[PDB]
């Protein structure tokens, strides 16, 4: 996505201060608790009965790290997001057949985890920058649909 340099610097500075372990697992973890219908795609994960068990699941925690990594790679290529996630699009679209609204939902649940983690530091203009990032990642992840 094409965002203003001040916002481009603001996201990188904010992402630099992120916990590269328990944020992705918190993002993928709240996806399954808030949107229960998505637990259907993670049957090879085991025990998702309580939110305390969904977050407190090593499989969720570990898989979330690779999801957060996909986003980190996404922040590096804001010129070509559509090509970075071209193979990931193929995976989620042509092979996993996940409904594309769920991509908007995980992207928005990351924004809800960042607000949780940073508090006062996730100001309205920082959100606006991140909303541009998660939309473009959701546009790139749903590319093999249009």
């Amino acid at each position: 996505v094409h965002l203003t340099p001040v916002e481009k610097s603001a996201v990188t500075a904010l992402w630099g201060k992120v916990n590269v372990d328990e944020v992705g697992g918190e993002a993928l973890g709240r996806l399954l608790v808030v949107y229960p219908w998505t637990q259907r795609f993670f049957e090879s994960f085991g025990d998702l009965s309580t939110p305390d068990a969904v977050m407190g699941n090593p499989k969720v925690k570990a898989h979330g790290k690779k999801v957060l990594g996909a986003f980190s790679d996404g922040l590096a290529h804001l010129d070509n997001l559509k090509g970075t996630f071209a193979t990931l699009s193929e995976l989620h679209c042509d092979k996993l057949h996940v409904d594309p609204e769920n991509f908007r939902l995980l992207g928005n649940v990351l924004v809800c985890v960042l607000a949780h983690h940073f508090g006062k530091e996730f100001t309205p203009p920082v959100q606006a920058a991140y909303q541009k990032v998660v939309a473009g990642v959701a546009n790139a992840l749903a590319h093999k649909y249009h």
């Binding site: 709240r30 608790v33 808030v34 939110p51 809800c112 607000a115 949780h116 309205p124 959100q127």
Partner: protein
């Protein structure tokens, strides 16, 4: 439809906001106009600047409209009937704007009340706001 557990979760979380209703509602309103610039087209009779006592004054009515909704939850179409006549009947608001403000409302509380924002409460709050969004976008005349 909300679980009885959800109705309590929303009451205990929104019941931790305090007199900061207008502050949060302002931030949510601000975050929304900032992140989704299209929601601005619904407010042309508004000063959509930062600090603006209009937007800070709107967030009062909004977060307060949300407070009576949480009160008589199991009566939300009767309670919000004037708001529904506004959003649904008069203003004719596209419900996407309601998903957006609801998202911003979750970010605000996430940022301000981090302890009360458990994944369980997030789910409960997302269901409540969705339920309130439904009521306000629907014409039940």
């Amino acid at each position: 439809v909300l679980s009885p557990a959800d109705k309590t979760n929303v009451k205990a979380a929104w019941g931790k906001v305090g007199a900061h209703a207008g502050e949060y509602g302002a931030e949510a309103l601000e975050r929304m106009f900032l992140s989704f610039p299209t929601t601005k087209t619904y407010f042309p009779h508004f000063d959509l600047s930062h600090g603006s006592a209009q937007v800070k004054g709107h967030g009062k009515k909004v977060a307060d409209a949300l407070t009576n909704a949480v009160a008589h939850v199991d009566d939300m179409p009767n309670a919000l009937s004037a708001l529904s006549d506004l959003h649904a009947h008069k203003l004719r608001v596209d419900p996407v704007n309601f998903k957006l403000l609801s998202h911003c409302l979750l970010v605000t509380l996430a940022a301000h009340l981090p302890a009360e924002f458990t994944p369980a409460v997030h789910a409960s709050l997302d269901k409540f706001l969705a339920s309130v969004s439904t009521v306000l976008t629907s014409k039940y005349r």
